[PDB]
Each structure stands twice: as structure tokens, then as C-alpha cells.
Structure 1
Amino acid sequence: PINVAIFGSTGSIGTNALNIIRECNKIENVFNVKALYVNKSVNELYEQAREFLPEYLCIHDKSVYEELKELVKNIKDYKPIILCGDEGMKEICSSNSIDKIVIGIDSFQGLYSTMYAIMNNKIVALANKESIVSAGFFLKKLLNIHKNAKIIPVDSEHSAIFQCLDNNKVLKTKCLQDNFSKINNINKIFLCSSGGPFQNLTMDELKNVTSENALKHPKWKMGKKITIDSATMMNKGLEVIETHFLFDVDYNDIEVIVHKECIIHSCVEFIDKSVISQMYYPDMQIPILYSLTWPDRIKTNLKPLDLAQVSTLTFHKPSLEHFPCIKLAYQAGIKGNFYPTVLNASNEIANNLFLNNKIKYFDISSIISQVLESFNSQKVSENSEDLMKQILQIHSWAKDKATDIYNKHN
């Protein structure tokens, strides 16, 4: 039985993880949910605690710790270890009774739990792409220290790539490891995207888009941050850099394709030019389940893909004029150093400004571009404690710079 912790259990990823775990457990007891960790959602965490009865409960926001302990007392035949903040998160990661950890915490904040899970040689089912984008080089370093840890990608495109690969070769390397793509005979990656809600808008129409309309994603139901990112295709931009770090694929070998039906989740071209792709309905349960079962697969009762009913699959190039965020991500990635950290941080600020109706669509990339331009390359610290400190400092600088740029205009 696979012992799992779910970090960000009450969010979009975390709810889907519990969904597929529940359905798989119907027949055979395959997963034991040992731990659940949220920020503030006490009532929803208690409802999940009632169903899954995990050994550990943890809430990041200490102000709702008492509320949680109180609700939980109403559950019969149950004495969980109820924990708090970073200290709680670190205690969960250090537990011998947890094998795999799903990271469904959003934004840069997800990096902390990712780091600690790795330091405790856990299997990390990583949905949080921001951590790879802001700290890819650091994570590679960390994984070469903690040799029994692994990152297994949960992001659907990266799970798709992972699945298309031959496990006979995947097993001889590790995500983030040097030469991953060489060992796997990868020539290039087609990173598939729904294209978001604004794919058919003209330049003049785009100028005027609002966050209410950005939140109406045509294919995926997700948290607010990634949903806004999908509308600007900054999501895809972050995923380009994520592809580079996870799979050691050169930036010139990663191609973004708009596939509006979202059935094909990504494709791998091998050195012989044969292409392999993974397909399913747009549904995070598959990539989540795969991260927890890899290198095996288990039976589900999910709806089978009906190719005949789907009928048509379409593909086109994205316009970099209409979606300049993609261009900025490639540029930041190609530059290397801490440019991805600065990209991620400034986007977190610009994404949230747009969400809250403070700026326009094209201001998002304008703010990001300006922060990237302002940043000066830094010497990369050789030890991991120093490097994490350096990452946090640059991430914090970039966020303040973005806000400063916003403050100067509006």
C-alpha cells in the first residue's frame, strides 16, 4: 500500500488527487492517505479528514489552528496529530510512514515543501510548476545530494511527456538529471496548449479583456492563478522552462502548439523522427494517478476516451504578438541564471494585479519585460543553503520591482 501526503488538499489539484485516490480504493486498498496540509480552509479540510482519516493534519495559517482542533473533536474513533505551519510541514516530510507527496500548493510558496520533501528522500508528485521555474538549478543540485528522492511530474503536459517515454530508459535516469533527454533519445517536444479563452481575439479585442472573462477557461477547471496564466499563455511559458529543467531539453527543441480540443496533452519526437503522444480528456486525475503509480499503472473506472465522438483534433502555431508572455519565458529561459526566478516573481505580481482589475492584458507582459530588463545576472552560489537564500532574495526583489513599476504608472 502506497502511503501518500497531499499538500494543498483543498485546492483544485488536491481535490482531484483525493478524487482519484477514492475511486481507486473502492476495489483494492492501494493508497493510504497519511497526511493532509492546507493554508486556511478549515471547514473543507475537516470534511476531508472525516472521509480519509489521515494520521496527520496540518494547517499553515496558525490563526485557524484552534478552529481545526475543535471541528476534528466531533469525529468519532479518530485521534490525528494536528500540526501547524512550516514546523508541521517539516514534521510530515520527515515521517518514515510517508512514501510519496503530492505538491498541489500554488506559486513560489510551493517551493518550501518541495525542498523539504526532497531533503527527506521522498517521491515528490509535483504539480507546482513555479518551484521548478524559480529554482530548477537548485532542485537539480538538491536531487544529486538526496539520491533516493525523485520529482515525478504532475503537470499534464509533463506527465504526458513522461508517459510517452520508454520506462526502460526513464528508470536509468531521473527528472532534472543531466543527460535525461539524451538517454531517452528525445529530439524535440511539442508542448500542447488549449490556447485559453482568448485564442481567437484580435489585437484590438485583446487590449480590452477582463479578468472575469479570463477566468472562463474553455477546457480546464482550476485555481485562479493558473487560470489567469492560461489566458495570457504565461502558463505555457512557465511550462517551456519546466520542460527544459525536468527533461534537459534545449529551448530550441521545445515547440508550443495550440491544440484547442485538449485531447493530446503533449508529444515527444524521438531521434528517428517517430513521434509519441499521450491523450485523454482534459482531466488532472490521470496525470495525478500516474505520478503515484509510476512505473506501474493501476485500473481505474474513468470514462474511456471515445475518439470517434471527439471526431476532430486541431493544431496551430501560437501568435507571439497576441501572447507575448510566451516570448518572455523563452528569453528568460535562454538567458538562464536567475532570469526564470525573476520571470516567475514578476508574473505572480502582474497576474494578481490583472485578476484584481488593476491593470490591462498587455500591461502584464509590459511589467514582466521591464523587471527582466532591470535584473542583473548574479554569481550563482555553489552551496545549497546560500543558493536558496539567493533565490528568495531575487524572488523578493522582483516582486517589489514589479509592484514599484505598477505604483509608478497607476
Structure 2
Amino acid sequence: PINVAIFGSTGSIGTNALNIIRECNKIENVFNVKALYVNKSVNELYEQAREFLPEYLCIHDKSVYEELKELVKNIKDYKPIILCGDEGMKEICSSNSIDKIVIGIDSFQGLYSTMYAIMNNKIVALANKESIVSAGFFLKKLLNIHKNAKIIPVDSEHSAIFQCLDNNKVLKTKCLQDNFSKINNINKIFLCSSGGPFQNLTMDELKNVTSENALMGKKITIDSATMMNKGLEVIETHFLFDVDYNDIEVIVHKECIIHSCVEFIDKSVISQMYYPDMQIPILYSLTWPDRIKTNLKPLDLAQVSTLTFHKPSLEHFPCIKLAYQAGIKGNFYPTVLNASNEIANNLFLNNKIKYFDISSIISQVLESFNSQKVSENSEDLMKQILQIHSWAKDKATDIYNK
């Protein structure tokens, strides 16, 4: 029996997590939903608490803490432990009745729950790429201290990579550890991309696209359009699997059947395939190193018929190159990249800047950043990341305001 807590349960990731748990429990009682955690969606959480009856309920916004208490009681025969804010978050992570934690909180924010889950030596099913990109060094340091804690990737491409690996080798190491690619005999990674909605547009057409043309969460949807998502996923790949940037190739695969591929040192390539869906990577992160039966629609390769692959144009998608450059430079440049992107993404979402202004703002912030001495100790490293994150957001806003 696998005891699970879902963080950000009303979100895209959270809903899909409960969907696959529900379906798999119809076949065999494998999962127990022990805790649910949201921001302010009280009504949606009440509805989820009805079906799964978790031991713990938690909401971040304390102002809606009373509303949740009233909605619970009429559910007969249930008394849950209702908690709030960061302290409730911490109590869930320290519980001995929980083995695996799904982090479905979006943006840089998700880092707090990730660290507490690691500190308590839990399996962390991490969908939040932002925390890996801004705080890869910090997570690596933390996973070194808390030796039983593990991050299992949920982002579809990184889940595919992880599925392609030999668990006989994976068990000798873990994600976000030095030497991961050497132990797993990894030579090269093909990181597949849908290409997003703007893939077939000219430079002239690109220069006038809007948020409407681009519009998953609204944030990841814009990132998909600029191919900044794939840029962030390159850095994510580097941290999770210890693969060199010169060994990661972005490939546009518009059918989204092959989710990513791993080239091993003998040059044999292994890839994971399925329909575009998040239930598989969520499930695997919870069943690893085993697999369990599902009633999901089987892949029909004859029906799919055709799979295509081509290189992305770096001229049309300058965000990709910026992410490689920030990754290669190392230090806190990926933190800066992520923070400046958050601002520029939102400005484009609200029709304040143009498409090529996104990469332009990000480039200027990166140029203005100077490498910093990396703090030796974990608490000081975390504060450093927060300050540099904050600085880069402010810098990006300032470039916009001039």
C-alpha cells in the first residue's frame, strides 16, 4: 500500500494525479490518499475530500480557513486533521503515515514544499520544473544530506528519460546526484518538444503574435509558445541526470508520441512513447521502481501512422539559446533566467510587450548579472537563491519600465 500526499491538488497536475489514483484503485487497492493541500480553492478541495477522505487537509490562505471547517462537518463519519499555511505544510511532510509526496504547486513557490519533503526523507514526485531550474544546486546539496530522500521526475519528458533507464543502474544512485549519467551509461539525450502553436510562423508573423494566439496553466502555455519551456527543461535535464549541455539536443516532434529518448554509450537509443497525457508520468513517479496495471487506452501505432522530427530554429525561438547559455555559464544564471522569464511571460500574457521583447528582457537581465560566491551552507544558499530570484524579477520589471 502506497501512502500519498498531493500538494496543489486542485491544479492541472493535482487533478490528473487523483484521476490516475482513482482509476488504479478500481483495479487494485494500491494507493491511499493521506493528505491534500491547496492555495485558496476551498470548494474544489471540499469536493476532493468527499471522494478520497484524506487524514490531512491543508490550505495556504488562512482567510478561507473558517470556510473549509464548515464545509467538512456534514461529510459524515470523517474527522480529518485540518491545517493551514507553511506550518500545516511542514506537519504533513513530517508525518510517518506518508511515503510519497506529489508536488503540483506551480512557479518558484513550489520550492518550499519540495525542501521539507526532502528534509523528511520522502519520495518527492516533482512536477515543478521552476524549483529545479532556480535551485538545482540547493536541491543537490539537500539530497546529499538527506540520503533516503529521492526526487522522481514528473515532467513528461524527464519521466520518459527516467523510464528509459535501467533500474538496476538507477538504484545505485538517484536523481540530481553527481555521476548520474556515468553510472547509467548515458551518452546523449533527445529532448522532444511539441514545438508549440507558433512553430510554423515566419519571423514577420512572430513579431506580432499575442497571448490570445498562444492560449495547462496559462504560464506553461506561453512558455510552450516561446519554447522557453524547452529551455527550462534543458537545464532541468542537466540537473536531474547530470548530463552536459553539449549532450542535450532539443528535437521538435509535433505528434507528441515519443516523449524523449536516451542515447547510451554504445549508441543504442531507447525512447518512451504514449499519447500526450500526464497520468503515465504521474503514475510512474508513484510506482517506481515497479509498474502497476491501468485501464488506459493502449497506444495504436498503426492509427498514429506517422512520426516527424526536425531541429528547432534558434532565430525564431531565441529563448532556447538563452537557456543553454545560462546553463553553460552555471552559477546563479539559471535562477536569473527563470526569474526574468516569470516577469516577461506575465507581461506578454497581459499584452504589455511583444514576442521578441520576452527574449530581449531576459537577455538584458542575464547580461547585467554578475556571478556570486556560492554559499557553502544550505540555509544560506537558499536565502541567496531567494535574493537573486527577487533581484532578477525587479531588474526585469525595471527594464520594462524604462
TM over 0.5: yes
Distance, in Å, in 1 between the alignment partners of 2:250 and 2:355 is 21
Give me the whole-angstrom Cα distance separating, in 1, the residues matched to 2:361 and 2:69.
Answer: 43
- 2: CA distance, partners of 1:333 / 1:303: 38
CA distance in 1, matches of 2:212, 2:59: 30
Secondary structure of 1:278's match?
Answer: strand
Superposed, which structure 2 residues align to 1:88-99 within 5 Å? 88-99=88-99
Cα contact 2:27–2:293 (8 A) shared by 1:
no
Deviation digits for residues 233-260 of structure 1 (CA, Å, limit 9, x no counterpart)? 1000000000000000000000000000
Matched, 1:27 2:45: no
1:164 deviates by: 0.4
**2-structure distance, mates of 1:348, 1:4:** 30
After TM superposition, give the deviation of residue 63 of structure 1 in Å: 1.3
Unaligned runs of 5+ in 1: 216-221
Distance 1:282 1:27 in 2: 23
Give the Cα–Cα distance (whole angstroms) in 2 for the partners of residues 110 and 361 of structure 1.
27
CA distance in 1, matches of 2:222, 2:79: 40
Residue in 2 aligned with 1:291?
Answer: 285
Distance 1:305 1:27 in 2: 20
Cα shift at 1:31? 0.5
1:102-147 deviation line (CA, Å, top 9, x unaligned): 0010000011100110000000000000000000011000000000
In the superposition, the TM-score normalised over structure 1's length comes to 0.97
Matched position secondary structure for 2:27: coil
Deviations 1:204-231 (A, max 9, x none): 111111111211xxxxxx1111111111
Query: Which residue of 2 is the match for residue 78 of structure 1?
Result: 78
Give the direction of change, closer, same or farther, for the CA distance of 1:326–1:65 in structure 2 (3 Å limit): same
- Pair 1:337 & 2:341 matched: no
Q: Do structure 1's residue 241 and structure 2's residue 204 form an aligned pair?
A: no
Q: Deviations over 1:354-374 (max 9, x none)?
A: 111111111111111111011
TM-score, normalization: structure 2?
0.99
Deviations 1:3-44 (A, max 9, x none): 000011001010000000000001211000000111011111
Identity among equivalent pairs (%): 100
Offset at residue 74 of structure 1 (A): 2.2
Aligned with 1:109: secondary structure?
helix
Q: State the SS of the aligned residue for 1:67.
A: helix
Instruction: Tell me, yes or no, if the aligned pair for 2:8 and 2:105 is still in contact at 8 Å.
Output: yes
Q: How many residues align?
A: 402
Tell me how large the CA RMSD over aligned residues is: 0.6
User: What is the rounded CA distance, in whole Å, between the counterparts of 1:298 and 1:56 in structure 2?
Assistant: 26
2:399 & 2:36 partners in 1: Cα distance?
38
Cα distance in 2 for partners of 1:66, 1:389 equals 33
Structure 2 Cα separation of the partners of residues 403 and 321 of structure 1: 25
Deviates more, 1:318-327 or 1:74-83: 74-83
Provide the secondary structure at the position in 2 that maps to 1:317.
coil
Partners in 1 of 2:217 and 2:10 — Cα distance? 11
Q: Distance in 2 between matches of 1:74 and 1:202?
A: 58
Contact 2:27 2:294 in 1 (8 A): no
Tell me the distance in 1 between the aligned counterparts of 2:392 and 2:347.
Answer: 15
C-alpha separation in 1, matches of 2:117 and 2:315: 40
CA distance in structure 1 between the partners assigned to 2:15 and 2:65 by the alignment: 21
Cα deviation, 1:23-76, whole Å, max 9, x if unaligned, reads 000121100000011101111111001111001111111111111111112211
Q: Does 1:208 align with 2:218?
A: no
SS in 2 for 1:174: coil
- Equivalent-residue separation in structure 2 for 1:55 and 1:271 (angstroms): 47
CA shift digits 1:168-217 (9 cap, x unpaired): 100111001110000111000000000000000011111111111211xx
User: What do the CA deviations read for 1:261-318 (whole angstroms, capped 9, x no partner)?
Assistant: 0000000001111000000000000000000000000000000000000000000000
1:317-348 per-residue CA deviation (whole Å, 9 max, x = no partner) reads 00011111000100000000000000000111
User: Bigger CA drift: 301-310 or 72-81?
Assistant: 72-81
d(CA) in 2 for partners of 1:66, 1:183: 51
**3-state SS in 1 of match to 2:190:** strand
Q: Which shows bigger deviation, 257-266 or 200-209?
A: 200-209
Kindly indicate whether residue 41 of structure 2 is the aligned counterpart of residue 41 of structure 1: yes
Match of 1:366 in 2: 360
| Structure 1 runs of 4+ with >2 Å offset | none
Q: Which moved more, 1:74-83 or 1:90-99?
A: 74-83
